[PDB]
Ligand binder design. Sequence first.
Ligand SMILES: [Mg+2]
Ligand SMILES: [Mg+2]
Ligand SMILES: [Mg+2]
Lengths: 110, 109, 145, 38, 65, 131, 121
Amino acid sequence: LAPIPKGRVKYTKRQKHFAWLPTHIWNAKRSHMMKRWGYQMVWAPTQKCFKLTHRLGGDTCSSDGALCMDSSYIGTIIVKDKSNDSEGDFLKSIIGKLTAERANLRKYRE
Amino acid sequence: ALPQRCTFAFEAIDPRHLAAPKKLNDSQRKTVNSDDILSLHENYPQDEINAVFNELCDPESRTQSYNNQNTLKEISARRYKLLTATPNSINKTTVPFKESDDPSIPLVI
Amino acid sequence: VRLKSRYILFEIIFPPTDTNVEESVSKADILLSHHRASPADVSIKSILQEIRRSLSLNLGDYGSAKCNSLLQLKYFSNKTSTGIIRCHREDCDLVIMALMLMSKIGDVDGLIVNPVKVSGTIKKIEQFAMRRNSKILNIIKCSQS
Amino acid sequence: DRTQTFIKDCLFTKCLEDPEKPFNENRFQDTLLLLPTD
Amino acid sequence: TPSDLSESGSKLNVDQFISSRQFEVKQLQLAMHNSKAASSTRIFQALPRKLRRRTASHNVRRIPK
Amino acid sequence: EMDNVIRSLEQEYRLILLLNHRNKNQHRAASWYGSFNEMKRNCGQIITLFSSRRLQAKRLKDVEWVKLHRLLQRALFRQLKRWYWQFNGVIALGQFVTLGCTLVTLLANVRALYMRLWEINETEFIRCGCL
Amino acid sequence: KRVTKHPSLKTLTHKQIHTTIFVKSTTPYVSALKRINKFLDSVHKQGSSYVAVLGMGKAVEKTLALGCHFQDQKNKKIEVYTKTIEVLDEVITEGSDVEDDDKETQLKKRAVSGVELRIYV
RNA sequence: AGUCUCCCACCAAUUCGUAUGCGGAAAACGUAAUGAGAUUUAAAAAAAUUGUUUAAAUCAACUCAUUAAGGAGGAUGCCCUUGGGUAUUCUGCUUCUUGACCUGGUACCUCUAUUGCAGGGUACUGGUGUUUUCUUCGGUACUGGAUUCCGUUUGUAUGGAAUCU
RNA sequence: AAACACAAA
Ligand SMILES: [Mg+2]
Ligand SMILES: [Mg+2]
Ligand SMILES: [Mg+2]
């Protein structure tokens, strides 16, 4: 498990439980903050955007704009087969066990 | 309208390099038919995509990307000295890219 | 704090009371025969005095005293016979009933008063008046054919 | 100041909708104080 | 002198400041709008509330004790 | 012919800096303050270069002519419209118009000096190495 | 055979999208009238002249009905144009037991006739 | 509701580079342990707010003064008496971006197209040096929409400029 | 009316 990075001692000392996004200060100055799952993510901006998100990001046609989400809290694992530098017959079964064999199919591989 | 398979990866410039978000060339906007979307499923540079993915996965190239990370003062001085260039006919508010003293950043879409 | 106002839009309609003459039955024909014009002897102080007399004559003394606190005619022109009467949100029913019980002008007879729109601001009243004026032109253009 | 006030009014009638609003409610200061706050 | 020195600091009078610079403002308005300079209506509209901000204080800051 | 324009420009820059020193904390986060601070940068960058006209005491320049040709076409036909639109929008609000009209007048008087410098320097611009 | 249909390519820059109503097969009549009136009132603030009304397939009939309404109701000049629309459809080609959605997707073109209806002010 | 404060561009840094009881982006912001205080006081009596507007037997309430984060050893108190858990106190390590500002001297490199000299940068030493403007003064950034012209495998795979609202 | 200000009171 990789630990928290080395940014600013002052701000690094604050968290001590929940990691900070690389845009924590900006979002905190723009949107609201909260700490639930060992992390600090955004809840909602100050200005109300109920109907704005519908007309911008939704399935609507009249959408002239864009929405940006800081989704760096989503953690990821990179897995590689080192039993050999060739086709991953082990990773095939690993994925077929981890998720349904929907994942382990010809489409998502090819 | 686009199909399911759409993954574009390449090496981009640091966004601090640009002064203003200049829009791309918009001249063939009218000549956009379904033949281009049909050919997009056929034409695909898998080699460069895999190269960028391996660069982003490997922790050596990912750290080499942090080789020469210029500061805002560096970019400010470069933009101030781009005022006096050899072509004295066109005003350029940007700074050209360098293959030696500049970081190549891998990105995935 | 805010003073709760409620403007009243009324129209003066002249019924074509003439039994000796035959008339055309249609939409725009009767709209034109009912919106012909207002007579020259028509102003703001002549309508305000008439409505003040009718209010005292129908309601009484206290009914006129409670209603005449903020009873004013803000905008009225005799070319289109459209007026905006300001009153309280409490006495709107009183002013409406008085405009309904309007019998006649002291010198001009044979006319009715129709309250159309009641709102608590002048901007929506103006918007509704513009919409009604635009609607009026449609049947006119259609019948001019 | 009269022709100056006319120029200011012809300038405010482009930005604002009621030109004689600030001069009536006294929002056009004739003096601009320039001093570090003490 | 558009600005002078006085009791507290320097005072800048808007009156003479825009009086001396009037033909320049006329030329600027002619360069911005050509046919609309003869007309007198509302060209600039109200600032959106989204871009609207709030005013801070005139002091620097208060240090923690 | 030049000294008068230089004195006018440095007299305008002094008032710009003096009112900026006071309006720095009053209106910190403002859209018009961005354009106001952007104007002072170009003003000072032209003022230091044309004060270098007296810093050297020679024939005027050799390459600062090219520098001026680069620095003149960034606020005349590039950032004049947005500056004027914002300087009028800060007045259209109605909260702060007293300094807004002065800022509009500042822009109107500063652009005239830039146009004068351009129309004066046309001849050696087309004469020396470009245009 | 399982086959899905995606929408048609729409390339509108900034203002072609604003003064244009795309009439769906499930779009009500009165809501379409309201949106058309709003577009007609907002056009000269957008800076255009006409309002585009685009419909294809089942909604063509009620799009022509919307046009015929404002034809004589408000006495506004209308223009009817007949265009072709190409749509891309993902089909499954035969080539163990996998999901129906996660199969071999091949793109196929299909041309359909549609009506564009412009209304003046 | 209120003549209170603050966010609503950034800056490996003349830009409060502030690891300072805890939480917090900041806040004339919340709260925790101890000691003291009453025009005889650090300060309340003869910036905002509030009709009365903290206390002045004890309690309760206001103000100010100290307590930097984590790991290891010993002692004491409790359930428990292999042992383990919690609280307090003393020694003491780990937490490391060659930075108050500014002046002078020396050493090296570049431009102004030979040199002494003129300006900038870096490495080192010495010093309170009139930093009495004890309240804002640094750097970069065209953020509405439409269309047209030109160059391109010789170089950059995209750049330059123009008209109207 | 509301909302704004190193105003004014
Ligand atoms: Mg209120
Ligand atoms: Mg109030
Ligand atoms: Mg309030």
